[PDB]
């Protein structure tokens, strides 16, 4: 289908700081991925982002009813919706499943990579550290980074580039809001 | 620090339209235009909260009218196709004959139109598959997830085939047990 496409994207954003102490509302409009007009609660009125949005900014600013509804959104819309879902969104804590297994950089040599699999956790905030005999190994670490699964869970693989020598005890330390102190998984050669 | 986004869209000539709520990059719920129902991302959300789907259908009607105005005002300037980047992953480390889920992550694309097909040994998989709606991004491109639960074996290979108007040929991303 070579037919030209035309896209209209309204985005009503609610930004929260210290719970509901400081709340910022943005009513943004995008035509073909380009922002044309926006209402920002820190401004208090509509502003054109491009010349395409100028008629809308002037028109919406001329209507006191539209302006008053937008100025009230931080309380009637943002703060309201935050409270509605707080128990299953803000309060959501899902423990990570931590697994440690040896792997290989390429299938032509022995185990030269130690993988720490950290999966099925919520929220995304996580810290993964590798330790060798009680000492932190900073160098030789490759990770997938934070992966969002799209079902309210996150995953990550933190790999240590090492040649394991017999007697060595490696520890993967995980820090997440779902658990009070850190989580640890040991692996021996 | 949290972010709640009510993301909507209307697309022509497809007459495609969606309405959803996003919380920190994750979907709370969306409203299906085919029906008139609030579809919750997880079952539990619908037991703790509620939404009147009528509000979403009314907003989509306004977006459609606004798109018409905008198409005329821009002197019929079309969208530039941004092709997606596709990643195939499993929700947890793969264990032989222990059930898992194959995730096809379709990212950084516009317009929100895509044909996604799971392939087991080159054959299409029509059953057991689930998908998300078109999810928003900070750069105003779209995200989408496609899911395929499976029994891991050394005899079954998988490929996620993605088609988009910004792509010359379909994009195929592979997964096999190793």
């Amino acid at each position: 289908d070579t037919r030209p496409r035309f896209l209209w994207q309204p985005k009503r954003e609610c930004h929260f700081f210290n719970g509901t102490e400081r709340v910022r509302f943005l009513d943004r409009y995008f035509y073909n991925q380009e922002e044309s007009v926006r209402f920002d609660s820190d401004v208090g009125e509509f502003r054109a982002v491009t010349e395409l949005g100028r008629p809308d900014a002037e028109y919406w600013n001329s209507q006191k009813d539209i302006l008053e509804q937008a100025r009230a959104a931080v309380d009637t819309y943002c703060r309201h919706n935050y409270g509605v879902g707080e128990s299953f969104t803000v309060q959501r804590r899902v423990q990570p499943k931590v697994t440690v297994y040896p792997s290989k950089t390429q299938p032509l040599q022995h185990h030269n990579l130690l993988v720490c699999s950290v999966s099925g956790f919520y929220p995304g905030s996580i810290e993964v550290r590798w330790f060798l005999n009680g000492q932190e190994e900073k160098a030789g670490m490759v990770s997938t980074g934070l992966i969002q699964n799209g079902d309210w869970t996150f995953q990550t693989l933190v790999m240590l580039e090492t040649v394991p020598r017999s007697g060595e005890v490696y520890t993967c330390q995980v820090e997440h809001p779902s658990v009070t102190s850190p989580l640890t998984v040991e692996w021996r050669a | 620090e949290h972010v709640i986004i009510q993301a909507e869209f209307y697309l022509n000539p497809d007459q495609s339209g969606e309405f959803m709520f996003d919380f920190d990059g994750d979907e709370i719920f969306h409203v299906d235009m085919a029906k008139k129902e609030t579809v919750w991302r997880l079952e539990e959300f619908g037991r703790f909260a509620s939404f009147e789907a009528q509000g979403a259908l009314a907003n989509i009607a306004v977006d459609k009218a606004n798109l018409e105005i905008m198409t005329k005002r821009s002197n019929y300037t079309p969208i530039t196709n941004v092709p997606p980047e596709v990643t195939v992953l499993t929700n947890s480390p793969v264990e032989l004959r222990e059930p898992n889920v194959l995730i096809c992550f379709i990212d950084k694309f516009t317009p929100p139109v895509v044909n996604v097909t799971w392939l087991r040994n080159g054959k299409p998989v029509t059953t057991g598959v689930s998908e998300t709606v078109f999810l928003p991004r900070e750069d105003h491109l779209f995200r989408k997830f496609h899911y395929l639960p499976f029994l891991p074996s050394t005899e079954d290979v998988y490929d996620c085939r993605v088609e988009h108007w910004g792509l010359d040929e379909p994009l195929l991303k592979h997964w096999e047990f190793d």
Binding site: Y77, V84 | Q6, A49, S50, E52, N59, V62, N66, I69
Partner: peptide
């Protein structure tokens, strides 16, 4: 327990 919709406004004119 009801999620509130930010009502869409029509552009000019």
């Amino acid at each position: 327990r009801f999620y509130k919709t930010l009502r869409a406004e029509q552009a000019s004119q």
